[PDB]
Amino acid sequence: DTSLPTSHTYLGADMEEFTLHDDDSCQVIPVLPQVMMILIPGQTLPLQLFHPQEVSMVRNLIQKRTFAVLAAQFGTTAEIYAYREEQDFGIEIVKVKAIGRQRFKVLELRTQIQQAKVQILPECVLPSTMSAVQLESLNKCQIFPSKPSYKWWQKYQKRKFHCANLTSWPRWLYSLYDAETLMDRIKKQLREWLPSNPIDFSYRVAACLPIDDVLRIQLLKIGSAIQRLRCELDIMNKCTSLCCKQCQEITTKNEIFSLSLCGPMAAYVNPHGYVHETLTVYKACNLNLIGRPSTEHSWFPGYAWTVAQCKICASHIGWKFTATKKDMSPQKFWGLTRSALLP
């Protein structure tokens, strides 16, 4: 279902479920070594930390919780939303489900398991673009009824930016720089192939996009919501397909679909530690399959995984997921790793 993968039931149902920091306040925060993926504030990150140093780090953090993830220019602070500890096999495995909360730029890298000194980047929220040239008379007209398509947004422009005749620019320009118009445009282009807050939605769809590591750290570098949303819209218009990094066309953009609330892609944990930013998709081609369908530790409940490697260079780039029951919607799909995909 759509809500099965979000809770990460493969990590175990029972977990200790439970941190706003001062804006621009530098903090000495732990950094884990096993995370090579670029996190975003709001993207859920689960984790399997079984190294002794990592386990001690998690115990120290949660004895207080927030830790950090690097890409190492910038990174993100994530608070731990779920804790589990198992002593099986003589190893004190610690299974975690954190979510990115805030951002930072890297200032220093200390070593003990790092304790990097990092400055939190504030959420540079801008007010309404018309808040400046808004006329005192027309201020009453800037609130709209609930959205009941094209005609509605034409009215939105002709009312909200009617004071864009005062300024030296057209209405549609401020629409390009409008928060809500960007909300609508990204939603339209996403449903072609979510929170009302521009910041949270911007981070959410930044997670959604199947983009390069360089583009994703670029988006992290962006401070304001409107800059980010504009960059994501430009990227989605620019993005067309996904190829294997070793090959340099496994899957096309339009085939992408979301089986999780987190989006088309989410961070999922290998059964023995590793993390993959796996992107769900309804169609993937040129993938030789290895392994019978197994439900062991399936990221998506009710589905059975099977390794998928591009037949050109035999490089693993994803898995095929087949529903255990025919009633499951959809019957089958694919999950591809961002680390091995080159937009």
Partner: protein, 783 residues
């Protein structure tokens, strides 16, 4: 870097208006909030009489007159966009006139974002208190307290639209139109001061029109409140509920109102399209109860942000979009409105150009003021102003020396059937030409390039543009080896579906022999937001692609280079080889076209997220800008990161939303002269100053702030401190030209107090009044 911001023309757009007895109980005056200025005009039968034009350190976000019990004349509550609240009394002592500040304070909350529906402020009719909807989810309340101690009351409805204090109530009662996901509702709260909290109002929530977006409380003996939206107009008073839906009002949204009769039987309304109605209340005697509502179209006036009926059928139509005008409501129709007086209003200045019309060496300025039917070309000289109505919104202007004419990028709103609402300058052109290369009632914007003679200002031509071909930017310039100079327009085809324009056109016109005939057109794959003559080669901004263009010998434009900045270059200024590119996010990016390589190369960059309105290249080092909240600033161009980074050297809160910068001066010490225009109809001026002069003038500013008691007691440093939704820092690198120029006006003993123990360098010596007055006179001579 050191700059000097002065006001060459005081703001003319009328932010607010309110009529009342401020001078005396027997003197009816119309206080006009011309943004940072407050004009107390005493109304007379002949007309308005200037009595006192006070300079406020602040934009008047709210104005209202009120007479507390025992007060001879009305006091004046002024709240600022910076949330400086001040209740002022007007004291007259012979020829000496001064506005005493009865009680001042700052009503800014430490937390809470500002309400999207504006800074509402309303006085209780019995004057027991002042209510203020500054931030969504809160209601600041000032009882009547020399410090204006305001306390918040939480309101559950985070989308209040318009709130007004009702009349004839046992205790104060706010009535507010708010919006839930259900729709618009009208809730009343009885605000208890002793409890300092909201109580259940006289009448509960009543659902109203989904676009009910204005509340007007009625005086006794009626009471209740009229509520106006797009189509229907309602009136609520307890059980009484009177509703009408005249066909007249559905055309345009009503945005302003003004009481005519003190009893409340006769009201005045205005809308965005300049139309002005008279909302009559039928009076029925049972006690008194309302009988019925009637709306009568008085007639078309200036596009009004406020209305004020003064007396004897005289109305002031206070307009930010056009000439604020004194119109008389004739008893018998002609239209019932007849314009008595027409006050100059330069706002909104959309673009301008300094040009020597007389060729006398002094630049006469030509601004594109107004919007929609109030559009005009305002010609400013040393301050004489000449208005040239266009009757359509002018956006961009450029001047041609050889043709002795301006090219004005005008835009008029037509209705699909397409038909023009009014006879505009484009439709009245001597020789018009249509360029060659929805549902009924939808308002399309037809775009023309007018050609206007400099001498007579008769529109010599009008080149209408293609369907949906928005004309963004226009430049007059020679190009390449071509001796002819061309009107070159950047255009974007803006269809309703496509948010970003995927198509556009750089079109090269030549106004020769009295006819503007296209010489060339390049169909660029994007929107041409800005445009300049970079050293004889044309530099254009095609989305996020700053592209140069050689004017070939074949009279065709050939692309030379591209520079993809990841930001569309809305602001494109040039000085020598230095190219200031910018976007509306304050993405100041400095490029340097290298002729040896024939390629663009970024040399500096500052992508600080903040809303931007205009830029300029003050010199090779310094770049003036205009930040989010009515701000000015100047950036400046050891390490590659330090070198490739624009330091935000100087800061300022102008108080006006700058639209445009232009190099020049209005006159025949301070190096350089960059005028700028505002939505509020100011022509200000920036001049780069020397370090010694800047230090002297900052010491002047401090001493004068010590000496000059501004009305409301607003500290100047707070007024000019930077302001954003997130930040507030003091100004640097700028000097308030108004404050320095005020030295000549303050008293001589005050002058001695100011210039005391001040070191002045002509060897540095103790300053004196005469020398420093001479300095400030030299400063005033720049404009």
């Amino acid at each position: 870097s050191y700059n000097y911001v002065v006001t060459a023309q005081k703001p003319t757009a009328v932010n607010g208006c309110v009529t009342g007895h401020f001078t005396s109980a027997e003197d009816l005056n119309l206080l006009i909030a011309k943004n940072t200025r407050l004009e107390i005009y005493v109304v007379t039968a002949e007309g308005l009489r200037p009595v006192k034009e006070v300079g406020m350190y602040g934009k008047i976000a709210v104005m209202e007159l009120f007479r507390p019990k025992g007060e001879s004349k009305d006091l004046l509550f002024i709240l600022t966009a910076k949330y400086n609240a001040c209740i002022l009394e007007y004291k007259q002592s012979g020829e000496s006139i001064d506005i005493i500040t009865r009680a001042h304070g700052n009503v800014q909350d430490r937390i809470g974002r500002p309400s999207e529906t504006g800074i509402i402020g309303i006085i209780d009719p019995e004057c027991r208190m002042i209510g203020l909807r500054l931030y969504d989810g809160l209601f600041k309340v000032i009882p009547l307290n020399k410090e204006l101690k305001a306390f918040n009351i939480r309101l559950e409805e985070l989308h209040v639209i318009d709130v007004k204090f009702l009349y004839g109530c046992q205790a104060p009662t706010i009535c507010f139109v708010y919006q839930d996901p259900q729709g618009r509702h009208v809730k009343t709260y009885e605000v208890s001061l002793r409890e300092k909290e909201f109580n259940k109002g006289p009448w509960k929530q009543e659902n109203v029109e989904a676009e009910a977006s204005m509340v007007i409380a009625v005086p006794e003996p009626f009471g209740g409140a009229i509520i106006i939206g797009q189509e229907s107009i309602t009136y609520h008073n307890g059980d009484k509920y009177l509703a009408i839906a005249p066909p007249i009002i559905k055309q345009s949204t009503i945005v302003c109102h003004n009481r005519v009769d003190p009893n409340g039987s006769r009201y005045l309304l205005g809308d965005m399209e300049g139309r002005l109605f008279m909302l009559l209340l039928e009076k029925e005697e049972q006690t008194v109860t309302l009988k019925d509502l009637r709306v009568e179209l008085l007639g078309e006036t200036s596009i009004a942000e406020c209305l004020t009926y003064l007396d004897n059928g005289v109305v002031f139509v206070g307009s930010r979009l056009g000439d604020s005008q004194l119109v008389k409501l004739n008893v018998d129709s002609n239209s019932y409105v007849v314009a008595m007086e027409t006050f100059t209003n330069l706002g909104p200045i959309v673009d301008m150009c300094v040009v020597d019309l007389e060729r006398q060496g002094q630049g006469q300025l030509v601004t594109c003021s107004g919007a929609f039917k109030e559009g005009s070309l305002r010609i400013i000289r040393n301050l004489h102003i000449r208005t040239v109505p266009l009757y359509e919104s002018p956006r961009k202007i450029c001047y041609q020396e050889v043709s002795q004419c301006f090219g004005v990028l005008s835009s008029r709103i037509e209705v699909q059937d397409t038909t023009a609402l009014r006879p505009s300058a484009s439709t009245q052109a001597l020789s018009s030409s249509v360029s060659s290369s929805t549902s009924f009632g939808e308002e399309v914007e037809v775009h023309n390039l007018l050609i206007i003679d400099q001498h007579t200002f008769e529109v010599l031509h009008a080149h209408q543009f293609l369907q949906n071909e928005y004309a963004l930017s226009l430049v007059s310039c020679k190009l390449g080896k071509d001796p002819n100079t061309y009107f070159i327009v950047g255009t974007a085809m803006v269809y309703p579906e496509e948010a970003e324009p995927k198509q556009g056109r750089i079109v090269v016109f030549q106004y020769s022999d009295g006819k503007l005939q296209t010489v060339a057109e390049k169909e660029v794959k994007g929107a041409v937001y800005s445009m300049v003559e970079f050293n004889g080669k044309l530099l254009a901004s095609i989305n996020s692609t700053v592209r140069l263009y050689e004017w070939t010998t074949e009279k065709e434009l050939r692309t030379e280079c591209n520079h993809y900045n990841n930001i569309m270059a809305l602001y494109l200024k040039t000085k020598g080889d230095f190219i200031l590119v910018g976007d509306l996010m304050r993405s100041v990016l400095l490029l340097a076209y290298k002729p040896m390589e024939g390629n663009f190369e970024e040399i500096a960059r500052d992508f600080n997220p903040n809303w931007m309105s205009a830029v300029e290249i003050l010199d090779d080092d310094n770049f003036l800008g205009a930040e989010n909240a009515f701000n000015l600033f100047v950036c400046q161009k050891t390490t590659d990161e330090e070198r490739q980074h624009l330091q935000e050297v100087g800061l300022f809160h102008l108080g006006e939303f700058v639209n445009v910068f232009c190099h020049g001066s209005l006159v025949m010490p301070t190096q350089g002269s960059v005028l700028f225009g505002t939505v509020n109809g100011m022509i200000g001026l920036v001049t780069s100053l020397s370090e010694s002069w800047y230090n002297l003038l900052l010491d002047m500013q401090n001493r004068l702030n010590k000496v000059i008691k501004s009305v409301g007691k607003i500290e100047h440093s707070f007024w000019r401190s930077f302001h954003t939704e997130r930040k507030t820092e003091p100004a640097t690198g700028f000097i308030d030209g108004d404050l320095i120029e005020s030295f000549l006006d303050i008293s001589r003993p005050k002058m001695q107090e100011v210039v005391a123990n001040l070191q002045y360098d002509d060897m540095k010596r103790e300053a004196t009044a005469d020398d420093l007055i001479k300095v400030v006179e030299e400063l005033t001579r720049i404009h």
